[PDB]
Amino acid sequence: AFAIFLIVAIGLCCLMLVGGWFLGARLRLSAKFYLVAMFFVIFDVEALYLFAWSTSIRESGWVGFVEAAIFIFVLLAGLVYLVRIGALDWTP
Amino acid sequence: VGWGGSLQLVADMIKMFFKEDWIPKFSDRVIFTLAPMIAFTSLLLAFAIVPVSPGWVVADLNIGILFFLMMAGLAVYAVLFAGWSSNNKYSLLGAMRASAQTLSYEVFLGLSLMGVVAQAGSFNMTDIVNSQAHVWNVIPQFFGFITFAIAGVAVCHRHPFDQPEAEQELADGYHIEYSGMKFGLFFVGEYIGIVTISALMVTLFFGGWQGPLLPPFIWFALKTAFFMMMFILIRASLPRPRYDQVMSFGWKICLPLTLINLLVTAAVIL
Amino acid sequence: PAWQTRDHLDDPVIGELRNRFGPDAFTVQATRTGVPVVWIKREQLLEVGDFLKKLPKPYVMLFDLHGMDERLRTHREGLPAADFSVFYHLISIDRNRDIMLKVALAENDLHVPTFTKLFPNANWYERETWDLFGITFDGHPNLRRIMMPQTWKGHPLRKDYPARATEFSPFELTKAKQDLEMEALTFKPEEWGMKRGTENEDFMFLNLGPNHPSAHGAFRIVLQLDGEEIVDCVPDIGYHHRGAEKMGERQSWHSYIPYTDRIEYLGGCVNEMPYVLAVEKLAGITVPDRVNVIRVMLSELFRINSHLLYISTFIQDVGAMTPVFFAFTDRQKIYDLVEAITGFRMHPAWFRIGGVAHDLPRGWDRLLREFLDWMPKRLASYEKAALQNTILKGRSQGVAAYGAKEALEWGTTGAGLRATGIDFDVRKARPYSGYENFDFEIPVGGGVSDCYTRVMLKVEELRQSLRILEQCLNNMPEGPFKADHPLTTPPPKERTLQHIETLITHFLQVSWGPVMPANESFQMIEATKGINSYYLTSDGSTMSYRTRVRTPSFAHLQQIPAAIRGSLVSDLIVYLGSIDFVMSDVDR
Amino acid sequence: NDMVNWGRKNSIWPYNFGLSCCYVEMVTSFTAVHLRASPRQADLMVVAGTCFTKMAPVIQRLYDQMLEPKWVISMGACANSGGMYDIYSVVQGVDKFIPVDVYIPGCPPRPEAYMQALMLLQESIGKEQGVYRANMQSERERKRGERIAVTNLRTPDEI
């Protein structure tokens, strides 16, 4: 089953690590601009609704496609907003 | 001379064993040890969802896709605890930019996979592998297939080519402060990653277990081998893309492509 | 003849200086340098230089500044009484003329006012004069050791200093422990130049020593950073010092020839040409025409190889390297021709005083004809691939540009100086090695010097070199490969094997060395990078008394801090790739 | 079993320390045999070029950085000894301060010489710096009867 395979994998990890042991302040302008990753943190939450959506669409039908188009159109409007304001651009 | 291509990886794994380990001074110890297995065990247990056989299935669980996405998200922590455990602003910023492009390019795989799981309509992999009985789910979704390809090769598979070097000065690749077995752990991890992406591609996009005139498990194995060779051919053909161009062709180009892909499949399925 | 010892007193510059200063102070030497050498006491140096700088046709470029020991010269007829000397070679481009100024110094008062104020490129030269000799230049901004480490006691170009490592203690690691302690305690005292900015959060000190590929050797360029801006860049050079100048003093005229090949690894016979030409100028040898055409063939082949490497590396670093790696295969074919003629792929060591080592083998014409017919189609494929590209072309416009005055003050020659509007090659202004019997053009960049203009000029020069090489294939004359003169070293070998007097000449020439009479020669050529020259002084013995090698790469690496001030680190790396500098040439 | 020996013979990781000159032939070799080589990961360091007195501590730190199994190849006359530069500013060989295993004479050596260096180093790595009582045999002595039996060579007036 899955539990046996998980036990095998963790046993292999223990075997390799045990065998290996026996064998023997100020950044200024640097970094910053992770806001692409903040865009991912928000966009994964947006796409989790599509993750739940993808299971049941045949019984959803026409209003489902309509309001899914509205949803992704709102996301596209936000994306072009971020592009045109200069948030989504070249980043260090 | 060695006649097999795989024997080189075998010799590499043997070589990484029995190498003296030095302690790093002014470094954290728990993450220095834990960062390799976040990259290794994740794609090792990503192998637990392949339908290699109906009778020898490794795990007959109802959902495998969400586990794959959970490993995709987990993978970033390996590059991040490696960056912090480097304890050198050069390597830390190198792993920060590598994790940047990683989180940037990991977005696409879930939304690209929504198309195939929507035309399949189930999460149990037996239903998907039985769905591709006469018509494979690759003819309509060309864009989804190439988007999933780009996403799968973009998760620390060296196609971005910013892992062992850095286009930007004042920083350095984060594979320098690891020199023991952990470097072999990275290589074996990306190896199981590429073979698992190929296996998932064949069993989720193309038709696994068909058996036109020969037993279907070797049919799956040979198709996986052909896609392995094609992946290596295009990985080698793929030149190094600088950081900028990768940022340009990220969120701009493939988020709309997968959104109109979901629109097209939802419009044609009913 | 073109080798006889002349005074050049009739030259107009000598009469203008005689009118302005009247009599006295000036002693006009007799030499075979081709230029007027004048001695001018150190108290009048700055006045003379200032007058020459503003003269109605000025000497805009200080070609060279260095020192001579002069203590052991027994033949000193006409020179003033000197224990040390410092020579300054200046060039007027609008006159296409040169002037050499020599200031004599005594052993107790080795002091002269610094010349950097007029010409900034002299600064490192004066620093070098402080390092290799013991002359102190009062008024120098940062007078520290630029070649040897900072704890090295002794001035290696003095004749009281033993030259060879054998006379010192071997690497016993007595100093390795102290250098280890020094490297572990890596701190900045702010003595590396002006370093006006303080060491705090406002300014960050970064060694920025590129050990990656295309760096053309490992070196450090200490950089002061503020807002990711280049506040001040100070190169730390001298890691690759090979002591070529000191080595020239302990080798015969014949056995030094191998050392010339390693001033530039890509030059080969180009590096040998000025040395043999200077030695034959000391000997008073006029060579036959076949020697000239053979030398032109080998020099244009090596120049083509170096230019192809520069083009390939330029397209690889800032562009797509997939197609241009085929040029590596083409370079391999050029090598099979060099080792077909000379014998060995790199460092041929094939030129000799008075000629070459052997005759051409009988199958040279078919191979050269095959290379000349095959090459033009590939060259035009690269011309379209490089002139018409847009991405790097758009990137490589206006990137750290400079003008004619800026190039002139920094001694920069070669594609840098030709990228501006000054039409000045030495192969046309001062023909050498029989270039005056050939028809070729000098491409020019117009008025803006940048990286695109430099590479386009290098492609145009490669096309002119291919025209020269076909003219060499179609007009190669007949006759000897060695001059007929008792100082031609060695004699023809078949004559040596049969004739007693030729055997005796060969015996004493290869054993004790040829005796060159005491005089001074000087030759400059267009090298693969810039203008490379050789100033040789003989004291009448079988070894050189002083060998000075002027390499342009020293000036090209000195030039980076004036132009890159106000740019990013990426622009710095792109400029370092663009500039034609090799560490072996900078450190000789 | 000697499986570890097979592991070490089959695979080695090269650290390229070629200097200003002498590295163009090494590149010629590397672009035919092979961005994989990385600092603090390799066990083989091919010292080439003129080892200068000023930068020798850099070579000593890079020697210290590598792992327990350390191999060193000296290439060129400038690295085996001082070479032609017997001068105050050049140390007379890299073997003065670090142990060396294989010496490859030449100035510069050939890419095939680099290939033969890998062959002699896998041959040395396959007999367990250990002589194993097999390295007293020398290339001066091994191919001696091969080289002495050569009588005629092509005349140098031909291509």
Ligand code: SF4
């Ligand atoms: S061996 Fe020859 S090519 Fe190599 S560094 Fe020494 S002189 Fe240069």
